[PDB]
């Protein structure tokens, strides 16, 4: 199906094999400090390596602009927070990493400290300078779906408009095909039932030629459909894991790294992958 | 899609709002005696209302003969085993009961001392007089697919001529197309890739026009494949379960009620159901 592996610098990741486990790592700050301490980083340290231990294949890293909090801080501020992870994680966990980001200052200093791929949840969008950063350090970058309103005319078919949007800025600034991933931003931009119906028709994104990577862990949708809280969401995680995987996708985006990557490694044996 | 719903005697089955949880119930068979005594009955009793609570739609109550011990032992002493577990559970968790079993005479017994459905893993072939049995008290029997070996030419061709055998046996005895429901038999006749293949294609058996019932839970193809014991069987399970889901199967089969349970909720919601 691939015809090429993705490139990720010193690791490479190969699209045919099998389901790709992105591990989610958020940090936990420092009150006290604008980041870099021992508590911090030693604590985001410690969580990539148990999920490097539990199957996860990328490691991905956000500071505090980024989901789930969304606080309004500076790049300044939130360079003194994620650059310290990425160099401790790059250094003593062996797996490619992605900042999660949709700032283009932080995007370069991120790479700069060791990140290899970046995840956008603007889809280049926010700040289109982030697609020339990426073009630059010839990383991949991971354009998800988004927009500031519910007004859909065609949910589906304003999606793929949507992400061919982001193809183009990606495009337009230097950003080869073989960097671009897709993502279709469940809970994001939808309602729980559009949710629902994009995951239904997940399939129709293949069309546009790129590697998929889902993200639908633990998010509020499932807790609207089971009427469960967040710590009790494993169960509906790992349907949309699945069905997700059977849609076709390349990668999943996870909190629970043991159970899903155990779901995945069962859908691909099943599906053929 | 289904025109009809299934008639369990005072209980009433609808096949399109949901996919339907059958609980597995395994006799644990006290020493020392023939069946019927208080620690066996209660430890039943108790399991049965823990899946009730859990989600549960049916309850499947098996006694010696059937998976997974499969012990020789005959039809009377069977009888003083099955009858009092399904006396005590019919009368306590308000729930259709399947009784499974391939023997005529035991289902005979099963569904005089209350059980709603039978469940025949030989499909009605190894006593044929068990679809009689179901003809006459005019209940819902289950044909699984199963054979004695695994010389097969074309695996999904010939489950499919295989299951419309039973089909044929079952309706020259006078059971109704609307009495009918079908298993693939995932674990039975099959080597571990047989069972891979069996669920890749399971979509197929919808064209027989049947409901489906699929039975994976904590089988040991997941396990070849995981690489993991029957107790950490969980993910795997619910795979199978989610992917079955996707292929249109009306019931799941399954140990884990909460989880499985939780999964076929959320894949439901996703496909439509
Ligand atoms: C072990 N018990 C906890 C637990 C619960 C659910 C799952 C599921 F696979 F996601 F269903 C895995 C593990």
Redesign the interface.
């Known amino acids: 199906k691939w015809d090429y592996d993705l490139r990720c610098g010193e690791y490479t990741l190969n699209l045919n094999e099998k389901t790709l486990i992105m591990g989610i790592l958020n940090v936990t700050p420092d009150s006290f400090s604008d980041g870099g301490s021992y508590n911090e980083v030693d604590a985001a340290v410690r969580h990539a390596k148990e999920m490097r231990d539990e199957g996860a294949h990328i490691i991905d890293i956000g500071g505090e602009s980024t989901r789930p909090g969304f606080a309004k801080v500076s790049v300044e501020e939130e360079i003194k927070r994620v650059v310290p992870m990425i160099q401790a994680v790059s250094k003593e966990v062996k797996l490619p990493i992605s900042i999660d980001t949709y700032k283009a200052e932080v995007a370069k200093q991120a790479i700069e400290a060791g990140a290899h791929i970046i995840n956008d949840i603007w889809g280049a969008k926010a700040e289109p300078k982030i697609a020339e950063v990426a073009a630059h350090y010839d990383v991949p970058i991971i354009l998800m779906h988004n927009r500031d309103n519910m007004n859909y005319r065609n949910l589906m078919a304003d999606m793929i408009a949507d992400l061919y949007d982001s193809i183009k800025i990606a495009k337009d600034a230097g950003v080869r095909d073989e960097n671009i991933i897709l993502d279709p931003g469940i809970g994001f931009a939808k309602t729980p039932e559009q949710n ?1 119906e994009a ?2 028709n997940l399939e129709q994104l293949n069309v546009l030629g790129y590697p998929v990577l889902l993200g639908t862990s633990r998010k509020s949708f ?1 807790g609207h ?2 009427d ?1 809280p967040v710590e009790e969401r494993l ?2 995680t ?3 894991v ?2 997700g995987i ?1 849609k076709g996708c390349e990668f999943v985006r996870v909190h629970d790294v043991k ?2 990557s ?2 995945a ?3 691909d ?4 992958k």
Chains 1, 2 share one sequence.
């Open positions: 629902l995951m239904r499932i459909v089971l469960l169960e509906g790992g349907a949309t699945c069905l059977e159970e899903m155990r779901m490694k069962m859908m044996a099943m599906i053929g």
